[PDB]
């Protein structure tokens, strides 16, 4: 539980240098993916004038 809390707070004893993990990956997702999804969403996606 202490190790999990440390990983949550970014104080993990060991860092997975192989790939992004922990709080850093969570922040990267919440920023990049969220921004891309918001930009890609069409405010009026789908309309028919007729």
């Amino acid at each position: 539980a202490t190790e999990y809390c440390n990983t949550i707070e970014g104080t993990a004893k060991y860092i997975e240098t192989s790939e992004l993990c922990g709080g850093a990956r969570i922040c990267y997702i919440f920023h990049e993916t969220f921004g891309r999804t918001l930009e890609s969403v069409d405010p009026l996606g789908g309309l028919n004038t007729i």
Binding site: G10, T11, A12, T17, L20, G23, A24, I26, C27
Partner: protein
Amino acid sequence: DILTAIRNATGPRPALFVPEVSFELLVKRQIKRLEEPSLRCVELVHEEMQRIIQHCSNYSTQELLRFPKLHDAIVEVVTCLLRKRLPVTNEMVHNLVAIELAYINTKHPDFADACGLMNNNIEEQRRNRLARELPLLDVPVPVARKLSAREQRDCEVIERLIKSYFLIVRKNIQDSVPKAVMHFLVNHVKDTLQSELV
């Protein structure tokens, strides 16, 4: 690797400050890497003591050679004393090494001086840049300050801090270990040898 460790230690919050977990991990690893030299020094001391004892028995104590049984008894007694004392020295060295890790002195003046020098380095560089053939380009607010290279600066600061801490630890070890070695593996052994023989 340093950049990845810094990014991971940043956590959910945006990267705006130098993480401390990575520095602690690196300094702990560096300190742990210093354990093997202590064992090598202990082994060298033990070998030197054995060689000195053998030389004394061979030359300085030729009378003891007249009684092979007595010489063998003395040799085995000394060897057993060294064997039983070596764990004591090893555990004392381990405790001395672990004391520094257990208690971290963040108020040491050396760390404050290093931090001050690191902070003043940027100001010195800016002054040097702005004090060398100042000006077509006669416009204020130079763009020389820039905004990138923050990660490189943080990595350099971390490396300098780690090197300074490693040097301080090495100096402390060099100053302390000889005293404990002399107190335990030499002085105490010499004092107790006569008592054990009697």
